[PDB]
Structures are given as C-alpha cells and as structure tokens.
Scaffold this active site. Sequence first.
Site, mmCIF file in Angstrom:
data_model
loop_
_atom_site.group_PDB
_atom_site.id
_atom_site.type_symbol
_atom_site.label_atom_id
_atom_site.label_comp_id
_atom_site.label_asym_id
_atom_site.label_seq_id
_atom_site.Cartn_x
_atom_site.Cartn_y
_atom_site.Cartn_z
ATOM 1 N N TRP A 1 40.601 44.226 56.392
ATOM 2 C CA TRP A 1 41.146 44.643 57.560
ATOM 3 C C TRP A 1 40.641 46.130 57.888
ATOM 4 O O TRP A 1 40.232 46.911 56.976
ATOM 5 C CB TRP A 1 42.694 44.287 57.843
ATOM 6 C CG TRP A 1 43.587 45.090 56.701
ATOM 7 C CD1 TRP A 1 44.199 46.327 56.807
ATOM 8 C CD2 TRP A 1 44.138 44.531 55.471
ATOM 9 N NE1 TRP A 1 45.230 46.635 55.886
ATOM 10 C CE2 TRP A 1 44.821 45.610 54.708
ATOM 11 C CE3 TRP A 1 43.717 43.395 54.604
ATOM 12 C CZ2 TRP A 1 45.486 45.652 53.825
ATOM 13 C CZ3 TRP A 1 44.638 43.333 53.441
ATOM 14 C CH2 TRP A 1 45.256 44.315 53.017
ATOM 15 N N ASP B 1 40.187 45.785 49.585
ATOM 16 C CA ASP B 1 40.981 45.374 48.214
ATOM 17 C C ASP B 1 40.205 45.550 47.078
ATOM 18 O O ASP B 1 39.006 45.510 47.152
ATOM 19 C CB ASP B 1 41.686 44.006 48.307
ATOM 20 C CG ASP B 1 42.631 43.929 49.224
ATOM 21 O OD1 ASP B 1 43.303 44.736 49.707
ATOM 22 O OD2 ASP B 1 42.956 42.697 49.776
#
EC number: 1.4.9.2
Lengths: 124, 122, 360, 360
Positions: free
Chosen positions: B51, B70
């Site tokens: 994101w 991540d």
Amino acid sequence: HISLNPDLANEDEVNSCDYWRHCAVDGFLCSCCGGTTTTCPPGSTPSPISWIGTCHNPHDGKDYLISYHDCCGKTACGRCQCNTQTRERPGYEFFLHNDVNWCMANENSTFHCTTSVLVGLAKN
Amino acid sequence: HISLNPDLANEDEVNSCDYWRHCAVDGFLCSCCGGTTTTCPPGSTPSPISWIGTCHNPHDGKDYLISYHDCCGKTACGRCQCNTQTRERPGYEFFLHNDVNWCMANENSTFHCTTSVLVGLA
Amino acid sequence: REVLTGGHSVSAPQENRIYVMDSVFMHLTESRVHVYDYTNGKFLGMVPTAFNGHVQVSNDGKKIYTMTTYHERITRGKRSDVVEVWDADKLTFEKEISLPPKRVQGLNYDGLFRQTTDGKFIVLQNASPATSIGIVDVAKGDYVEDVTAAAGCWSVIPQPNRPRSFMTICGDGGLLTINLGEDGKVASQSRSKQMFSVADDPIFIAPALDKDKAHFVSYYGNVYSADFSGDEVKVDGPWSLLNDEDKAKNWVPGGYNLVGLHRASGRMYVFMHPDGKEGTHKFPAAEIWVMDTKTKQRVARIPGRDALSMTIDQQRNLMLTLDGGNVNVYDISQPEPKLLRTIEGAAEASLQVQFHPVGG
Amino acid sequence: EVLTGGHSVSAPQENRIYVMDSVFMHLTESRVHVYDYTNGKFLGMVPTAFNGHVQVSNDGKKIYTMTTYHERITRGKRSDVVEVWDADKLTFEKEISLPPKRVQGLNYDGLFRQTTDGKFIVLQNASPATSIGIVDVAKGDYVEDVTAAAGCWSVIPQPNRPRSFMTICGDGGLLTINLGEDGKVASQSRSKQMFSVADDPIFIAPALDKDKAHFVSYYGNVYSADFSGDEVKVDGPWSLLNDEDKAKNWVPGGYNLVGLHRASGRMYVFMHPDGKEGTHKFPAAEIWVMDTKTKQRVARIPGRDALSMTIDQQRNLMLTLDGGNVNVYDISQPEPKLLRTIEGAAEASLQVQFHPVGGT
C-alpha cells in the site's frame, strides 16, 4: 460421592488448579475448554497414553489413582492453565512426568487441553 | 534533512508510531524487529507490492510519497505494533488500503513486519 | 471408574452460540474461531484456522466454513489456500475445498467471506493483488467461478431477497450486482449508477443490511443506500447522521464491522466517536448511535465501550459488540440497547463476531 | 529508498543469545528470539513451528532446530525434523527427516544436544518408549535409534571425548554411549547406581564440567558422575544445606536450574524455601553459589523468580530467565553481579543459550 463426581460439582471448583484431582496437571483444563473432566472438547481426541499419579481426596480422606490424559488434534485451548507437580518426577520415571506432551502418540499430536481421569483407589 | 534519514535518528524516535513517515502503518515496525526502516530483519523477504500514501513531514514542512512494504516469510515479529490510518481508504481504493497483508504475493505470505519506505516528494 | 472420551457435540443449543474470530495477530499462523454461549459467557469449543482464518456459519446452521492458507512448512514450501467445511455440532473437519492461491489475506470484515442466501455457494474475495470474487459450490466441494467482472471492486454484500445474488463496491463508487446460476457461474450482472464519491465521501464497506436494501455510512458521517427490491439497484444519499450539535464536536463513524440493521424496526446501529479528522476512521466507539432509517434521525445514543465491531441477531433482537477482546451482549428489542453482559477474554485479537444462524 | 533483504544479524556473534520461546498459548508458533545480551537489542528470530527446540552448532556457524510439522497443522501427515539455519543470515538451509517420535516437551537442554566434536546431533525420542536419535549433520542423515537407552532420559555430552554422551536411567545410574565415526553405537557402559530414584530423585539438568557432571536432587543433595577415566564413577550425596537452610526447608527448584563455572568449580543453583512435595519447579527465591571442591556455599543472591539459566565459560557470565525476562550476571567473582534485565524477551521461555565463542 460428590467429591468423585465433577459433573455434579460447582464448575468454578472443578475448573480450579486447586481441585483435588488436578494435582499433577501441566496444561489447560479441558473442563474450561468446552469439554468436561472426562470428555474432550468437541473435535479433540483423547490420548491413548498419559502420565499418571495419585492425588489425595481431602473430602473422603482417600488416595486415588489418576490418569492425566490429554485431548489432542486442536490448537491450544488457552484457558485454565495449571502447573501442579505433586509427586511428579523427571523423564527417567517417564509415566510420572508432566513436562512432555502426552499427545505425542496421537494421530495429530497438537496439544489442546489436559485433564485428570479417576481410575480408582490407589493400589494397596 | 535529518528528518529524511532514519538511520541517523534516535532509534526511539524512529521506532514510534508517531514518527512522521509511519502515518498509514498497520503492523510491527521492522526497525524494532532486527531490521531497519529500509532493511528487512535477517531471513525475511521484502514485498514486491505495497500500500502507498503520502505523509507530511513537520520537520521540513514538505509532503512525501511513502511505500508501505512488508517483510515476509517469517512469523509475526510482535514488536512495535502500529495502526495509523492517515489517508487510508478501503479496499475499493486497494493500494491505499492497509487492512490486507501486503505479503500476499510473496513466495511465502507469512507476515513478519512492515515499514515505511520513502519514495520522494509527493 | 472413568474413561476420557471424544466424539462429543457442543453442549449448548445452536441458538445460544456465537463465533468470535480470533486473528491472534501476535501469532497469526494460529488464528482460530472461539465458540461461546452468549447467554452465560461459557466457552463451548473452537475451530483452528491456521494463518489469518476467516469464518462463517452456513445459513442452514449445520456447518462452519473456514477460509485459510497453509504452506508445507508454514514459512516455506508450497501454498494451499482452502475453504474447509466443518460440522457445526461436532466441531470436526469434514472437507477441504481447493482455492487458487489468491484468497484475501486481511482483517475479518464480514464481506470478505460470505455465502448466497440459499446457502448453496460460498462467495469470497480474492486479491493477487488484482481483485476478483471466487465462487465455491458447497455440495460439489469445488471452486467453480472466478468473477473477473469484479476487478477493482471489493467485498461481498449478499441480497437477502434473492437466492444467489450479491453486490460488490466498485472503484467508480457504484455497485456491481452478480446473479449466479444454479451451477454457481455468473448468470447475469448489472452495474448501478454512482452511489458515493470515492474521493470526497468514502464509505465504510460494512453494510447495514435489510432484506431488500443496504445502507452504508461514510467517513464523514453520511449515509448512502442501495435498494435492490428490483433487478436494477437504485442508489441514493447522502443524508447525514449528524445534527448541528453533533457537527460542532466533529462526531464521525469509526470501526471495522461498524454498523448493523434491525430489520423489523429499521433501526441502524453505528459506532461513533467525537473529534473526528483524517485518520480516525478505525477508532474505537465512544458511543453507539441508534438511527431511525425511515425518518433519517437519531433516536438514541449509548456508551460504546471502545467497541470496534458488531453483529445483529434479528429474531432474538440482540446486538453483540466487540472491542478486540471482549464481547458485549445487548438487548435491542427496544430503541435504547440494554447491556446484558460482557464476555471477557473471548479473544486476543478479534474484529469479528457472528451469531449461529437460526433463520433457516 | 529501497527495502532490501539478505542482511546479516547486526551485532557480532559474541554478543548473541538465543531465547527459545515456546509460546505455549500458541505452541504451533514457537520461535527462537535472538538478542544482544550487552544492550538488550532484539536482533532477529527463527520460526520453529510446534514446540521447537534449539541449539547452536559448536563451531558457531549454524543454528539447529528440531520441530514437528503436519500437512495441515492439526491434521495430515507428521514430519519431525531437524533444520539447519545459517546463524548470521537467520535463513533456512536444510531439513533432516526424523522418525515421528522426537520429544515433544519443555525445553530442557538435554533433549537436543550434540557430540563434543560437533559431527552428530544427539536428541531424545519418545514414542512414548524412549530412545536416543543420532543425526549426522554433514550428511543430513538420521543414523539410527539408540534403543539401548530405553527407560533413560536426556543427553549429557562428555566434553572430554569427541562423540560420547551419557543418559540418566530409571535404575538411578548412567548409561554412557560411545559413537563410531559413522554415528552408530561403538560401545556402551552402565555405571553403578548414583541416586535413589524413589528416595532422592535428581533434576536432570547437569552442572557439567569437562570430565565430570554434578546433579542436584529434589531434597537439595548433590551427586556426581566422574567420566575422567575408562568408566563412569558415581558418588553422592553431599548436601547443599546447612542446619539453618534445612530448618527453613530450602530446596532446589526450576527447569534448567543449575550451572557450573568450570574454571572455579562454582555451581549455581536456583533455590526456594518451604520446600515440600510438589515445589520442585517453583521459581527461584534465591540463586546459591556452591564451591564444589569445598562443598560449601560461597554466595546467595535474590533469584528474581528465575526458572532457567545458562553459563558462559568464555566471558564468565550467567543468564537467568523467569519465563519472559532475561537477567545478565557477571560471575567472575564468587558473588554474581546483576548487569541488566532484558524485559519481554519471550512470552513463555524456559531456555536461553549463548552463541558459542571459542570452546575448543
């Protein structure tokens, strides 16, 4: 009578680590996990093997043989964790020992909960 | 400016959810997990997707584009959990959304930690 | 004297049961569903759901469905995304249904894992990250359809007035309706006009779902509706949740599964907090507001107990709220909810609670 | 900026410790936490699935783990394994298949060990029948079961021999196993009875010297096994307790509850007062420091509720662990000095270990 029949007794307890028959329990009490003292929570499987020992019944004054079977095949219940050690001994006296997973020989060894099954009066 | 270079800052500042660039972070900060803001902890793998969003830098007064990558393939780090939501939007604006696992397309999707990668000025 | 036995069923009737989906985010590979009796707070059992499980109960009450991801060695090896069918009374695994390796991994919004009203198809959200909706035929135990028409849309809102129809919220601010055939393949589809501005007044995805219409609340406290009493969905809104006094203290909605509808009365329940501003849309509830959707006005407000997610049981007039760890049980038979009890420690990290279905 | 992987642990090996977090509440997601003991910094971790065990290779290059997988975690085929991980990259390198009977239990050191020469991993099995498994690390092979160890428990390597170890048997003696270069049993011997299993059971954790091991008993006695000569010579008891100690019923308690500082002969033991049947795993009220030559106590300090410890001979340190927090002590003088506490190192750990430095 009453002291030998947890299903009739106050749930608060039977679900306590101080309940007389839970005297060498390492793990989550099945009676807090949707089961009872002698019935696995739904979808968990009894262990065919267990650690064993005797516990003193302070109501009737007698000593009883207990089989500390687990229920297996579901992830940790997480409720009513006990770690009582009366007469517990290390792994060189293997069947008195409670720092091993008594689910170890089940089709699925994942440990869910443990309990205290009354076999009868201590042998004499 | 020092406010752009977390490796030069005090770790306590960078490891906080109120650090300016962590403005839409959902998860454990990698800098608390044996990595740094821009390096995955050993044995965890960066996400190729993320994101994104902008965050205001109150230290220089400018706005910056951030990619919230991540690190993946190890079980949950458990440290420095954040849940900031500035300009975060639901899954119908998918790449602004942080309630999904941005490790979802990794070789191993197990979520380890997350971070805030500075792309440039907004 | 005694013998430990297995094979037992859940001790409380289905109608007492609720399902607390515990993500266990600190240990997300050991997520699980905790089953509780809402009438007394008793723990009844659980279903393991591996990494970031999702859960629902079949509409007929007989089965539990889970959705999860496995890998051969957890953090390495081949990925298997699945739906599992479990018996609801024995809490035992029955069947694995293979999914393509793109099932949504994310927080437990209801709309990510749903079913048709008739219960014959499971309808789930995929993200690879490209989005599509997957259809599972429960009877056949097969993934049967992949709705690519839903690319750029998100979440599944079943239509309770049709057997195999659902809607999804799309990137244009409108709704895509999918009507499945009896084979689970798309039988028809339609697209509404724009309901909301994605940029200017984003809605929360959680519907306040009536039999023939759904309401949605926005980040700024507006309400939008989608009426599906016909084949074509008619959209409207906004009306504001807020009066002038409310606006003065910047009240806005916040949470995850943050709304519900009591169908018999038309009352809509919404988690709200003051001092709203950019970034507060997932804040815990300061209050629950009770809105009359017919008059478009608030009728009651009560303390929110830091709740994040809710669910409603229509036939017993109950609302559950959930703060991440504790479940509050409310009687909503009258306009002001009445707190009956709090189940403490129902989960470590849950954003979703659901009742066992009783409506058939 | 660009997020990158492939990095090594930031602190040098000599700073590292390994906290084996069982995560008993979620035991399928156990892991090793790597910390810097000099400053409390978290350095990384190794996932270890269900009830992992861990050790570091004697040469300091690799981390060995032992764990159990199933195809679907709570169902499906079981795979018990040793894994070899690179210590500096904290990456998986190799899996070694074990028979499906590796010990599942709390993390006593003696359940997962290695020969002094580092060529063989030596692990405890229980089906529940007990045997010792030998793994040839380089070849990646399970060599075979030492069924001679039936009715015994745990592995005590002999640091004065390349591929010899002992185990504690139900007769109160020790069985010594000497491996050939292939890892098969080349010879064995059994000691005379060291302790009464019935009357003075010993804790399994050794206070291990180069050529002897000491053991403490449930009632605070000390036994020893001297393996400096051809066969093991056993002795004891001598008491840890003086009259005042006995009067307050001081006894040992804990898990990995003892240690030996080899250069001084100091033995470290967790102790608590008001000992009676059932207190053998109680947290430490105190740590006692005994001179094993004089058989006298030389220090006593607060226990900080510790349960497990480990000693580093090369830096003269003791770590203690209360389940969650790690205490770092300087033990270069008879009285240990507390340097720091690392808070929240684990949720449920009973074992900490140093990264090896030197030790040839």
